[model samples]
Target: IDDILQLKDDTGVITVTADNYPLLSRGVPGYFNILYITMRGTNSNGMSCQLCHDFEKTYHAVADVIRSQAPQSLNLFFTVDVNEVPQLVKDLKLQNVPHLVVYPPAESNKQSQFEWKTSPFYQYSLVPENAENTLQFGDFLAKILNISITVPQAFN
Candidate 1:
């Protein structure tokens, strides 16, 4: 089934580790990268965060929705927790958590490096708000990308 379908059994999201941090600036084809930088506790001196740890639960829940809806092509979701790489974080000057951005395929000559676009639904005002849930999120995305995707029964 894996061979025929071309999708893997894994969660299908890449974790950006320190070693690979330098390569993220490069862009590739058929890829939709979501660099979900996490927000750690501010005053705890970076030791603790996510008191409930369930945002990951909800985030992963919606992440699967995005994954399942992706066509046979163009599905490359990734995440980068902020606490992991303090230096790299400063290098990029990332100012937000769940700091989502995406890159489309580019040509060699014309494309600028790391010319990522912000996800239109980059809102974190509250839970169940815009882009918080997968159904509304997916629908808006479909409209933006000018294509349609199924809302899994779980999402519906």
Candidate 2:
């Protein structure tokens, strides 16, 4: 992601790009939580893909939660525009444009290179039964990270 460094570091959630994806190689040393992958939907226009915008709020709110709280040490969030990186789309086999992928901390020498469709981390961590409870997800992530935080009302 070319703009990775520009990511609001405090929240950990970010919008990644082709130029900076390589940086993720160094992200597995237990530095953050939830490497939330996202998509831009379209370059043509908003009409091409409204789906991404629909989910866009989800990612935004997720970020708002941590940003609103004191503990920025909770989760790492990032939104990536798939069009900017075709290789990532192929490697991740991204079937859904607006989806999340939570790569768990390294269990081996390195964490999994990418989130697979059947990856347990993606299954439970991202799909927590009810995404409707957005704040709860943020809070849950904080709990797992052993940090305490409260999402702001704007997110609700």
Candidate 3:
């Protein structure tokens, strides 16, 4: 599939492009885009931003949880590409990748209002490797999204 950026609201209706019909139909209710990075000769084991934070499934799952607690007011989006990275860095002033940047729904500012803690992989850290560390990263994401998912509590 060609690269694209998809935008949506809390209602699960696609308010952006038609190219993401398949993903949107699957219950995604957030904005996301695929990266244009060259993966040639790199390890296939490498992960994309969509791996654990799946655009279609994760957003819907988190939204469902958020709605149950209160009137959900979160807006999620995924951005990719080197060109986009500079603007993102300028906006969020982030020091790494595979990071999640969150913004309040009503905010017009492009800067990230919050960011989830991340694993070495997401932060581009070179360190100890283990499943628990990965799950710790997931826990960080859940906390940021305010979703009550059971992540590896050991990391807590």
Candidate lDDT scores, in order, read 0.52, 0.55, 0.34
Candidate 1: C-alpha RMSD after superposition: 5.5
Among all candidates shown, the one with the greatest TM-score: 1
TM-scores of the candidates are 0.64, 0.63, 0.31
Global lDDT of model 1: 0.52
- Candidate 1 per-residue C-alpha lDDT over 2-106 given as tens digits, one digit per residue, 9 for 90 to 100: 221232337766666677565553434435454456654553564444431435554566567666665454545556666787655777676655444544445
Which pairs clash inside model 1? none
Q: List the residue pairs that clash in candidate 3.
A: none
**Per-residue lDDT value at 90 in model 1:** 78
Candidate 3 lDDT, 57-138, residue by residue in tens: 4334433444455344343343333233343335334544333334222223432332221101122122224212544444
**Candidate 2 lDDT over residue span 71-145, tens digit each:** 545345666667776666776777655565565555555455433322345432334244445566666666556
Residue 47 lDDT, candidate 3, scale 0-100? 50
Report the lDDT of model 2 for residue 50.
Answer: 53
Candidate 1 vs 3: which has more lDDT: 1
